[PDB]
């Protein structure tokens, strides 16, 4: 028999795969994506009706807490000689 890793069987499979099977996958993808969009729109409409009843630089530190934490950690690694990249 031909193994699962047999080259000629995998070549035939790839030829088959590029056609009707990939067509089915793509069409299912389009249908599911449309349903996902309609689900979001329906949630927006429900929330809107319910609320009718009621009525950039990435430089620097992430925050001051992050600044203090990373500075203290790097100083500690320097002091204890536990750095992966520095001496």
Partner 1 sequence: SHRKYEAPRHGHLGFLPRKRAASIRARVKAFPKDDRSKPVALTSFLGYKAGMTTIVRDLDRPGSKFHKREVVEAVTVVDTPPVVVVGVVGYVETPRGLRSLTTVWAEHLSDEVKRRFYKNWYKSKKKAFTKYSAKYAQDGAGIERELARIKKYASVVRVLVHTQIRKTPLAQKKAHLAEIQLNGGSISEKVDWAREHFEKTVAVDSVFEQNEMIDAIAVTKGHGFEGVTHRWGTKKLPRKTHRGLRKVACIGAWHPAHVMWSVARAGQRGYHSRTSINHKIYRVGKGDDEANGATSFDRTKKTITPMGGFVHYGEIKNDFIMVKGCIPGNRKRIVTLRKSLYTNTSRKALEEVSLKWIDTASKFGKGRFQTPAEKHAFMGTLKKDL
Partner RNA sequence: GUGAACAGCCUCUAGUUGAUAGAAUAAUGUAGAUAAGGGAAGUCGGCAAAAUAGAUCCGUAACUUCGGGAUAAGGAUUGGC
Partner RNA sequence: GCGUUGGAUACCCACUAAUAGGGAACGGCUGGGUUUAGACCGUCGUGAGACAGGUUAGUUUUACCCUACUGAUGAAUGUUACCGCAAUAGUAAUUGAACUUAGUACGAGAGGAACAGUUCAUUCGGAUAAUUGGUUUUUGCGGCUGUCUGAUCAGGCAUUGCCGCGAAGCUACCAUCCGCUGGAUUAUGGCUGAACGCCUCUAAGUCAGAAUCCAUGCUAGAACGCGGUGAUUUC
Partner RNA sequence: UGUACAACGGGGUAUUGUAAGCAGUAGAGUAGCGUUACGAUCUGCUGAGAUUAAGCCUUUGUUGUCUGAUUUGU
Q: Which long-range contacts (CB under 8 A, 24 or more apart) does 31-38 make?
A: none
Residues of span 40-59 touching partner 1 by CB under 8 A: 40, 43, 56-58
Among 44, 62, 67, 71, contact with RNA (rule: CB under 7 A): 62
How far from each other are the two terminal CA atoms of the chain, in whole angstroms? Answer: 59
What mask of x and - would describe binding to RNA in positions 17 to 56, judged by CB under 7 A?
A: x---------------------------------------
Number of neighbours of residue 81 by Cβ within 10 angstroms: 8
1 contacts RNA (rule: CB under 7 A): yes
- Cβ distance 61 to 70 under 8 Å? yes
H or E stretch covering 4: none
Q: Which does 28 bind (CB under 5 to 8 A by kind): RNA, partner 1, none?
A: partner 1
Residues that bind RNA (CB under 7 A): 1-10, 12-17, 62, 65-66, 72, 76
């Amino acid at each position: 028999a031909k193994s699962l890793r047999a080259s000629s069987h995998l070549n035939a499979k790839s030829v088959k795969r590029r056609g009707v099977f990939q067509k089915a996958v793509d069409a299912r993808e389009q249908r599911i994506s449309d349903k996902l969009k309609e689900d979001l729109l329906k949630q927006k409409l429900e929330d809107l009706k319910k609320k009718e009843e009621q009525g950039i630089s990435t430089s620097g530190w992430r925050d001051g807490r992050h600044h203090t934490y990373k500075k203290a950690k790097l100083m500690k690694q320097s002091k204890k000689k536990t750095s992966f990249t520095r001496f």
